[PDB]
Structure 1
């Protein structure tokens, strides 16, 4: 209730990353335009909380990740932090854990996440995008994964996701060369899911998110769980898997769906 101080307001506005609620969407907005959204420790550390906020808010159905009005999604890592975070082995290990946690938080979001990409999406930028469920990019976006250019190695999680999306050959091409490639190529590789006109990615993501928001959220969330399960060893016989299917018939959205199909009208689903 208490209105702020001027400074408090500025601190929340100049967060290098933030959450905008516009029901039924929530938008994780990268917000360090001075550095073309280069990913810093402050940002990585904030992500798991932002994702939680969004999943906790019943008015939100879908999460978007985008680069705001910075004309870039994420231009790799903040080199100004390199001295600090790579000074010691311990600092380095911590940086890794912190990043892995952010990506895992996104990947395992109960509610689905769509990445909307314009301009530069390199290094951790690709990692973020890959952690999202869906990716849409505007023509002119540039993609690259560059640890080989530093003498590093792309982590297991990041590598697993990339592999799942584009396969072994393309994953190696990307990682062995560290090359920057175009959105059109990314599209044919299967690295992104939809390719749109330059500057329209965010609008495209929003309408797409609208399509998803209109169907049963019970189903959407369950489908996502089922897919993650299967990707990590579930089988047809696995109990969580069988029972996940069976709650399909028990939830509030299901009766409305049956009825809607019989009446030939769009479903007005209630589960939130």
Structure 2
């Protein structure tokens, strides 16, 4: 039926829209492949400055679609989250629905998270006997270690205001999509060279160790 992701080109921007609302926009190999290709297309256009991740229906992203790992290897979900943090593009998540489990990590790995009245964020992994090890670093770099780990242990649900007050969302309002035009106007005041250097410097100051992607991937598989 419909492809996992619909791509829309704009002025200096590429939008990837999660486009399976009837399945609650879950993460399958197809979604991860399509989002990577979309970021590749955006990065391959030297005039592109911004990558916008948005969605459809009641669910922004519901996490793994349930319908051995070599020493040193990492799973594709980890790789995609690291790319959203390391892209020369400004990455912007427009959250106007429920982000559940791996869907939280997907939003959190973006440079800016915009949350509307329908936004909800909840890591449900401990209820399935899992540690959300791949998502956690991307949440903890926003919320700090205590709120990320306590929210995991409690499967805490954040609405838009709660997400904004803990740093999981950068901006909050009635509708995330209506927050986007002023964000794009502001990003148009800088350039891709500058945004790239800024995100590379964030990795210099707040690095993730070389073994973490493997260790996080292995912990998710081991359980």
Q: TM-score, normalised by structure 2?
A: 0.84
Q: Deviations over 1:109-165 (max 9, x none)?
A: 11110101011011111110111111010023111011101111112x422221121
Q: For the residues of structure 2 that align with 1:50 and 1:210, how far apart are their CA atoms?
A: 22
Q: Deviations over 1:157-194 (max 9, x none)?
A: 42222112111221122100113231211111111111
Q: Give the gaps of 5 or more residues in structure 1.
A: 1-10, 82-89, 234-272
Count of aligned residue pairs for this structure pair: 205
1:229, CA displacement in angstroms?
1.9
Determine whether 1:208 maps to 2:208: no
Q: For the residues of structure 1 that align with 2:184 and 2:143, how far apart are their CA atoms?
A: 23
Question: Are 2:88 and 2:192, in contact at CA under 8 Å, matched by a contact in 1?
Answer: no
Question: Are 1:123 and 1:144, in contact at CA under 8 Å, matched by a contact in 2?
Answer: yes
- Larger relative helix fraction: 1
Q: TM-score, normalised by structure 1?
A: 0.70
SS of 1:191's equivalent in the other structure is: coil
1:55 is matched with which residue: 33, 39, 43?
Answer: 43
1:165 paired residue number: 142
Q: Which fold has the larger relative contact order, with Cα–Cα distance below 8 Å and residues 6 or more apart in sequence?
A: 2
Which of the two has higher C-alpha Rg? Answer: 1
Q: For the residues of structure 2 that align with 1:179 and 1:219, how far apart are their CA atoms?
A: 36
The runs of 4+ residues in structure 1 deviating greater than 6 Å are none
Determine whether 1:179 maps to 2:179: no
- Larger relative strand fraction: 2
My pick for the range that moved more, 177-186 or 137-146, is 177-186
